[PDB]
Amino acid sequence: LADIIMEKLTEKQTEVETVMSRVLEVYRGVREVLSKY
């Protein structure tokens, strides 16, 4: 019963997933450059 409940919970999680559905540093640097360029 616990295994069946776990399978049902996994199916519910999959259904919810269906229902809901290095450059950062350099571009933050050029952001700080262009903020007061």
């Binding site: 019963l1 616990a2 409940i5 776990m6 919970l9 999680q13």
Partner: protein, 111 residues
């Protein structure tokens, strides 16, 4: 956007989800999710079921609590030991909350 909804855990879980199968309450959900609280240390899914059992546990299953207090307690000691060895916050916080609910409702009790 989804927390403020009436169907969410804000209001309706506190009212109609406590009636597990039409009768409030059944810990068969709690005892069935042992396979999730065992051998799975994934965050943000343990926290959700911990929050849900924290809210559901308040609706007085008192003779069942007195009966399987041993099962709940051993489950909780393995939960706190694993979480203290791991070092998370949310799951520990609501397992403390459900400890509070269980000990308020009810030798090993001193432990």
């Amino acid at each position: 956007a989804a927390h403020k909804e009436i169907c969410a855990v804000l209001a309706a879980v506190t009212e109609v989800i406590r009636s597990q199968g039409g009768k409030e309450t059944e810990t068969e959900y709690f005892a069935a999710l042992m396979t999730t609280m065992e051998a799975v240390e994934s965050p943000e899914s343990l926290a959700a079921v911990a929050y849900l059992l924290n809210l559901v546990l308040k609706r007085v299953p008192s003779p069942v609590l007195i009966k399987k207090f041993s099962d709940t307690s051993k489950a909780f000691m393995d939960i706190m030991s694993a979480q203290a060895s791991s070092g998370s916050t949310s799951v520990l916080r609501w397992v403390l909350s459900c400890l509070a609910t269980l000990l308020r409702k009810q030798p090993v009790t001193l432990q």
